[PDB]
Design a protein around this ligand. Structure first.
Ligand code: NA
Length: 192
């Protein structure tokens, strides 16, 4: 179920993020960011779901945290606010976090959505969250309504947009398309 670190690494490389990508991390951010270089990373917040994306723009001095569930989990939000502050202390500034949900609650596509955000960051680091060709494919919904029936079609359309984007941009995804689709499916966690 979900996506492995090696899957995500292969897709991020296909998407052209390699020059800025620091790796995949277990629970913690990367050790440091540099005042001189764009950087991004994927963090497993649990230690094949629980994926969040990190990015850093040294020119705007902005850290981005992309979370498909809009930081609707208050403990997760608290943890990573502190991680941000600690990262700045190790590195010697603004944090922009997701505020709306783009993924269905029964989906296991978290890691894939993080890859899509990293494409957006690598290409439009001045505006990675929204108002760019990649993220404009995806629509956020209010967190309080994440579990409401009426938003599920929007969250499903987001996932369809995600898969179609990956088919166009990632040879790895094409080579593993049916497998990854099955493992990450929109209702992987609901069978009613
Ligand atoms: Na969008």
């Amino acid at each position: 179920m979900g996506s492995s670190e090696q899957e995500l690494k292969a897709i991020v490389k296909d998407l052209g993020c390699g020059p800025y990508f620091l790796g995949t991390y277990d629970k913690r951010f990367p050790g440091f960011v540099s005042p001189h270089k764009l950087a991004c990373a994927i963090v497993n917040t649990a230690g094949g779901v629980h994926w969040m994306a990190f990015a850093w723009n040294p020119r705007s001095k902005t850290c981005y945290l992309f979370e498909p569930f809009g930081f609707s989990d208050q403990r997760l939000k608290q943890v990573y606010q502190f991680e941000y502050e600690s990262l700045l202390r190790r590195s010697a500034i603004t944090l922009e976090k997701s505020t709306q949900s783009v993924q269905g609650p029964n989906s296991a596509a978290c890691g894939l959505f993080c890859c899509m955000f990293l494409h957006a960051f690598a290409n439009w680091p001045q505006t990675p969250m929204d108002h760019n060709p990649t993220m404009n494919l995806i629509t956020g919904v209010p967190n309080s309504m994440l579990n409401s029936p009426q938003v599920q079609p929007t969250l499903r359309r987001n996932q369809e947009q995600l898969y179609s984007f990956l088919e166009r941009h990632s040879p790895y995804f094409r080579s593993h398309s049916a497998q990854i689709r099955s493992a990450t499916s929109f209702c992987h966690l609901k069978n009613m």
